[model samples]
Target chain A: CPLMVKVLDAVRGSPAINVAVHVFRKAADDTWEPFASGKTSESGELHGLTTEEEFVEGIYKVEIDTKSYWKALGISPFHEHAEVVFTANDSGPRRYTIAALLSPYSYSTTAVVTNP
Target chain B: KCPLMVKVLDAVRGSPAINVAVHVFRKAADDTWEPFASGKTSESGELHGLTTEEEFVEGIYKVEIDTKSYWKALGISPFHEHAEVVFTANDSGPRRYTIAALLSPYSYSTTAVVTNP
Candidate 1:
């Protein structure tokens, strides 16, 4: 099962402009499933979960929507979107936190979970 | 000292979709670290510099790249590379910003120097 994810948008040493975030998890069966969606706050931050509970220990993915974001800024986007995927192979008691910053051009993310 | 940025390719979400972000920081004249810039791009993979042209100052800066994230997405081979572009600008003069990123289901790379008009 996949859980919480936090995202921040930074541009040129400042928070990113208006944008939306979409998250998806890949099942072992090889399928894309939507989990959570939201927009970045004025400070260019957004957070949510992959689901309510852990279903299985496997790989999960995230998507940052940058197309509409650039349209709102009236700029021709050099990119369309950004995506990320991570693993959670442990079923033991533990906490996991994944944070990422995204743009049409690039992004950064880290996992805050202890390996079991 | 120079400037830098990170970009994401393929807006879709999945094991095949790669997410990318960059954090910008500058070294003060005193050699202290401070947050000079930040942003997240749109679904089209886009972000911007909020500070105006006059906000730029001369100094060394850093842009942290997220290589691990992109690698996990493509699931092929993760041999990622990133660049730190060094340029000089006047504190009271025009400040330019440009950054980009590239990635596949397995490989990725980025450049800190941007071509901004």
Candidate 2:
């Protein structure tokens, strides 16, 4: 998978299962053009967001619906969504791991990237 | 509310990072780091009241955490030597701030919450 996401829940100490994820690309018109989308699994991972061939080099955005995750557990969160934007696949076919940590009142976003 | 606070979470174990050493520093006029406060996270993986509202005046500050030792204690080698967050604080007035971090063996995240009370 060229692009994947790993989300964790700080409260339950487990992977954040079934959280919605949306991918977007920065279009030439300066708009967020919709790209790939998926949801986390029981392991709190979403794979195959985009294939190597289709994952072009450009600016990208990954937005996770954190509010829904917390509300399902009967809690209100601090942010409606957790988003991280960056330029990807700059040098080569880069594999991106958009890792996110979620809590009721906090969230952390980190991108672990590699080239192959 | 505490003027400045910090909370750390372990993404590997899904728990609060207990007893991680935390140090606070402020940037001087000459852009040098000056020590402010130091402490360890509580059982809840949180450190609070690092500075009084009156004392936490506006400036650039850094919250540094000892992540390498914390991860090694769990028998996993980490990617970062340590984790640090640097940003301007209290641009308008002294506010209630919480620095929450999530740490994994190879990755970590920082999302800071600053609000007025």
Candidate 3:
């Protein structure tokens, strides 16, 4: 099984399509290293970026490049970027799901572990 | 007749913000804020208890949200700790008014106006 993430535009109550998402993992050296990156689909969903076998337990960050997306929509960027930080527990089945609720100026994220 | 109502809502979700603290104040003669009322939003994001001739007096009023308490309840880092709406109430006689606020963690807007009740 793989870890998945979804992005939604709360203002429009719809999916945020074609938005860029970047993931980073904290390394043992206390530095963040790039893990995976992808774009949302037409349904505003991103999937299969990481698998349970390759997962590491630690703090992880997901940065959404909302500036470009807002510009593409001809709207002013209220926030420079939307950064989501979460902890990955080692006790989980290695599969996880995250959902990001985003607006022009605000964002919130929630995550849960799922069975492989 | 004096009637004042407030509605707190999420701009993005277009939904009522339940159980959030809201405070109302009137500007004193010396420009200091005098507390008028404080309470939490109900399930419908409505607060409608201000109804007195003194409350309808001509003056500058302010409404502020206790973002700290709201964020603490949600267990999320707060981006905006203070959200306020300021306006002036000028009328020849007793009247009714409404202050509607739309808010998010980082942005907010308020609309204040006189209305017939």
Candidate 4:
């Protein structure tokens, strides 16, 4: 897979099933254009958000709607959105896995990039 | 008050990750990593006594958690070797930092909250 994302629910210790993940790519003039959007599966993973052909070297933003996720669970959270911003696939075709851990009051974002 | 602190949570159990080993390192002038402090998480999954505000100073620092061992103790094969967060501290002024980490068997995430308090 060229790009993938995994989001875990910290409160329930399970995959963030059905959580919304929106992907955005930075435009040439420095604008955020919606690239793709998907929801986490039962296993909390969303693969093929973008293909290698279109996933060129640039800044990408993955916004996990923590606000709605927590609200669905009937709990209030500190951050409205758990956003992961980074540059990807700069030199070559590399696979990226953006893992996010979410809590009611806090969240963590980690990136694991590897050669495809 | 603790100037630099850390908290770890187990994403699999939805509870505080207690007794996890934590290492604090500061970048040395020669560009080598020097051990600055070490501690384990308390019952609340909070780690303290890592450093003082005055001692934190201005430099790049790393907080690494031996997450693999923690999961191994629970009989789970983790994906990453360790979970680490690196950033510059106190460059603008004295501040307090809280590094929070969430870990599952296959994934983990870490974040920091900096404040003047």
Candidate 5:
């Protein structure tokens, strides 16, 4: 199991649909590189974003383009992007879940690490 | 001119940040944080009882979120160690003021102050 990211519309308590989610992993050079990226599904989830790639125990960041979504929704958002960070532990084949709740002005997230 | 409410929500999701810790403070003449009230938000992302124990005087007041633990419960890491908001409270026009906070995991914004006459 790898890292799965879920996005939701915090105001409506519904899955945030059709939003771009970018995942970046810390590189050996101590800079963030584009590790993987994709848009959320109809259910507002992007599963196995880190599964296809090799897993490394380090810091990772997820960025959501709320500005684009707000534009599509015909509204103005508080910020340009909604981002969160978490550390990947070296717990031998662990799967993690990162879930975020977002609105036009604010957002929150929770990440859990589980074993296969 | 009462009912001073502080509402917190997910900026993108438009949902309340439920059961999250919230603290209110006032800046004194000496520039010290005088803690007023502390509690967790409701399901509607509101703090129920903001009283006059310390009194809402005229000056800059602040409200902060316990971001670290709040996001920890949601299984997300907090980019900001702590999130705080500051505003002016006066006895002039519009005695009632509402502060709205929109937040994501990586970013947060304190929206405009809503007032009532």
Candidate 6:
């Protein structure tokens, strides 16, 4: 049977935070298939990944590029940087949403995966 | 002689998933000599517990609550707590103070400033 991993979380600041998400699955060569990549939405989310791709139960990580994502928008990185890690199930079809919130002040993110 | 109202901004939260939550705290006392009662505010900008507008005395009041459970109900925890503001007041004139807080697990704040004296 496949395993459904619990989603991990990370938060910083109060309004603004930058996030970069990476997803992969086990390949025949024992490596991972790089599925999708993107930033948080205008409301601070990376929700559209599941609109197409699906995972097959493996290791997953979401990296929040604190210093650079904001520095590009002209923000200071004096506060902190953060990241979150969790696992997902690969048994059947599913949809997942990765959302993040950011501003010049704070950030938080979550991933919701629903299946039939 | 500041007037409008004296109130409470609560950040209370109950939980199912422990450790995975946001938390908030405030001082039991304050720089403001005006007395404070702790709880969520009433709809008309009034605080709960105190019956009359003339009941508040002079002393710093402090109240603290968590905001995790509320977010948990929605399957998210954006913030852990809210703000702790301190403003001193006296009964020398018509007294009115307004304290309001807008909250989410990720962000929250309040003000103890008002005018109605």
| Steric overlap count per candidate | 47, 0, 0, 0, 30, 33
Task: Enumerate the candidates' DockQ scores in order.
Answer: 0.03, 0.07, 0.06, 0.07, 0.20, 0.04
Tens-digit lDDT string for candidate 2 (A1-116): 98888888765667889889999999999999999999889999999878888889899999898889878987767789988899987777777887887766667778877776
What range of 10 consecutive residues in model 5 chain A has the weakest lDDT sum? A47-56
Clashing pairs in 3: none
The positional error of residue A73 in candidate 2, measured at the CA in angstroms, is: 28
lDDT of each: 0.54, 0.83, 0.75, 0.81, 0.74, 0.45
Docking class of 3: incorrect
Docking class of predicted structure 2: incorrect
Off by over 4 Å in 4: A1-116
Residue B80 C-alpha lDDT in model 2: 81
Which candidate do you rate higher for lDDT, 2 or 6? 2
Best candidate, DockQ? 5
lDDT, residue A26, candidate 3: 91
lDDT tens readout by residue for model 4, A1-111: 688888877546578887888999899989999999987889989887777777788898988887887778887667888788889867877888888777666677788
TM-score of each: 0.43, 0.54, 0.53, 0.55, 0.51, 0.37
Q: Which residue runs of candidate 2 sit more than 4 Å off their true CA positions?
A: A1-116
Instruction: Pull out the clashing pairs in model 2.
Output: none
lDDT score, residue B113, model 5? 61
Worst 10 residues of 6 chain B by lDDT: B14-23
Say which candidate scores most in lDDT: 2
Q: Which lDDT tens digits does candidate 6 get at residues B1-74?
A: 32333433222231122222222222334433333343443334344333234655554444333455545665
- Interface RMSD score of each model: 8.0, 7.2, 7.1, 5.4, 6.6, 9.0
| Model 6: CA > 4 A from native | A1-21, A24-33, A39-44, A50-54, A78-82, A90-93, A103-106, B1-106, B109-117
Q: What are the per-residue Cα lDDT tens digits for candidate 6 across A30-49?
A: 67667666565444444555
